[PDB]
Design a protein around this ligand. Sequence first.
Ligand SMILES: Nc1ncnc2c1ncn2[C@@H]1O[C@H](COP(=O)(O)OP(=O)(O)O)[C@@H](O)[C@H]1O
Ligand SMILES: [Mg+2]
Lengths: 50, 521, 70, 141
Amino acid sequence: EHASRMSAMENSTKSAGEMLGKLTLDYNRKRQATITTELIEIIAGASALM
Amino acid sequence: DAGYVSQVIGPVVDVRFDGELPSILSSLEVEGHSVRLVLEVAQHMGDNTVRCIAMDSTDGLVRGQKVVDTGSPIKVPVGRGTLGRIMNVIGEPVDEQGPIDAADIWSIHREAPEFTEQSTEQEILVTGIKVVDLLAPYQRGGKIGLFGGAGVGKTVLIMELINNVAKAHGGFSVFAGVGERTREGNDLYREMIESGVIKLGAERGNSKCTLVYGQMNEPPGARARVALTGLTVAEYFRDIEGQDVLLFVDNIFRFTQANSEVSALLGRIPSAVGYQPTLATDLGGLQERITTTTKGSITSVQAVYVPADDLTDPAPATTFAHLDATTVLSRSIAELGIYPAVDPLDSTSRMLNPNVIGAEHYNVARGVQKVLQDYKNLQDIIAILGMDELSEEDKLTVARARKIQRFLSQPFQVAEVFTGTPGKYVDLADTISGFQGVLTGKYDDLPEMAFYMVGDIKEVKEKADKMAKDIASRKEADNKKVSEELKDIPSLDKLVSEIKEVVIEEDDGLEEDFKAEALSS
Amino acid sequence: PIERQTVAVYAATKGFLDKVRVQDIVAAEEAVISQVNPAVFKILKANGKITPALDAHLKAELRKVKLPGA
Amino acid sequence: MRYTIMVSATASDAAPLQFLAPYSGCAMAEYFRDTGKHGLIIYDDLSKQSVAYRQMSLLLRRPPGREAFPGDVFYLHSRLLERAAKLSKELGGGSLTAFPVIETQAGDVSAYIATNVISITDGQIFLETELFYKGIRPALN
Ligand SMILES: Nc1ncnc2c1ncn2[C@@H]1O[C@H](COP(=O)(O)OP(=O)(O)O)[C@@H](O)[C@H]1O
Ligand SMILES: [Mg+2]
């Protein structure tokens, strides 16, 4: 039992590393997108006054 | 001699003055308007034109309407003659009790006191709320912030701080309602007639509170200046009458939101996430006046709304550097049923130094926070696995923290209609004695829900002894009570026949009402 | 109506609707609103409270009811 | 206080006065560096200086960049912080040690002023709030 939990908890750290890698790619895409979004909001408010 | 309206765009009015423009921050009056419309000069636009924010609605303003300079800023009545009254942003009474008697009328704009007349004295303000006076204790004379998103309990906590601190103390109180619901401003008004804080009629001089109200329906020019109006009433009580004041401000967030609503119409290119470029210095000009000086003392309690439970947002994040005690309320504490939903870790006070509150209050507070922090580092592994590998050192600190978590909950005397419980005032010594019991294992045998919504540790023992009476009192009513009674559970149409059948009118009859409203007036 | 809501919430919070399959609680209370007395709703609507002369009188009338499966 | 100067541009002061206070505190501290002695300058909330400088720049209608900050907000803090040096022996050998203080929000060191000052400075003393409630005080990550 201990030697199949060891092979089960190895297969779930991979699955929690593959999921963490897809989330970090998804987070960096959202991080880049909210910096572009807040900046377009700032330039639009500035171009409406200038 | 006077100016005229040149431009009306929303709440922002441009007034053109032929000769001798009014000063910035000065008050202007539009005559000919349907109501009293007060403008306040925000800037000089540069062609003999000032740009103003309106303290009321600009519906019905006309370009060319005569504007009278008053020669000073907005002046409101201050003194004992405002105790027991509700004021406007511009000092008008909105409680329909006549004109406001005024010792003096004061400009709502002044500078911060000085660096030389600051007070370096720390003494604890005991509130009765045991999560407050244990972990983040308030200072008598300092600025207190109540943070939290929508619906976590900022207004109930600020209501419980009114009747636990202001109901019996030496000086006066000022409630500044800044841009919140009108319904709860009426709830606060009627609660203070019944509590005797506000007395009406000829007993009005024995009042201990002044309400200044600028609630959500008011335009952004109004809600941006109510906090200055209520602070001016508190600054008269501190500077002139030299006495201790309590100043409660519900949502100081709405002061920053109101300035942000007019800001782009004042010609300012916007700052980060949507606020005005002058966000930190508009807020800083307000909070620097709410201080204990060498003349008197203003104990401020400010609710701060955090938008979408985000303490990262610039309007809550700027407020954090202005306070001496930041009670942070959390949704996750509220969703479990612990009320007041105070985050016990995120709440920080400056009275939590050992050379201020002593060592037997500091070590209990740092001990309670250590057990609650450890439990949150184990709750990552309990919610996955389920606390059968947790060492019985870690199992004991889960049971100790879960008792500590419920023992920070307390029934409030003002939440007696949400929770069906009479409220509990807990003294400071009984809070220190109780949590030192739960920390050192003096009460490890008591159940977990015996700590929930009680006063002190003597009422945990009066509740654990109660629940262990009343769970073994379950089986008296199982084998009987279905039948064979003294017939005060009587027959069917016996209970149907005392029903006083109310007459239904079976048509609305409003067109007879609508013609009747025509003949009246 | 509000009187048939509180009777159905009474039938679930006073333990009269366990021993009932969780798939047909939707059909269980359709019996419970229809098989209890149509006069017990009128008393609860007129009083607005479930009185002590009624909370036993309804929970003993929530036993003379036929539920699916049971 | 017999060794300390305090330059205080508080919250009610004008945003030009909070922008210039780290620079005027540095010039007071550069006296000891330039005359062979040693200095310790602490810019407590250098992130509050940049907010005061962003206020002046948006009001002067200078074109805003990320989080509405100016273009020269890196040049703001680098020109200040590069004045903390150890001087050579032919200039007295004096020194100035800077401790800028940057407040993050939710521990985000990818924020725009935080990445600027991390670039300028040599090290960082990261204080994490999760270690602060574990009893580890000073809560140094
Ligand atoms: N101490 C408390 N005890 C019981 N219920 C509470 C307490 N604090 C808040 N609540 C519940 O939370 C709801 C919202 O609280 P409220 O005072 O409106 O907070 P906010 O002003 O932040 O929205 C209240 O109507 C009440 O039901
Ligand atoms: Mg509220």
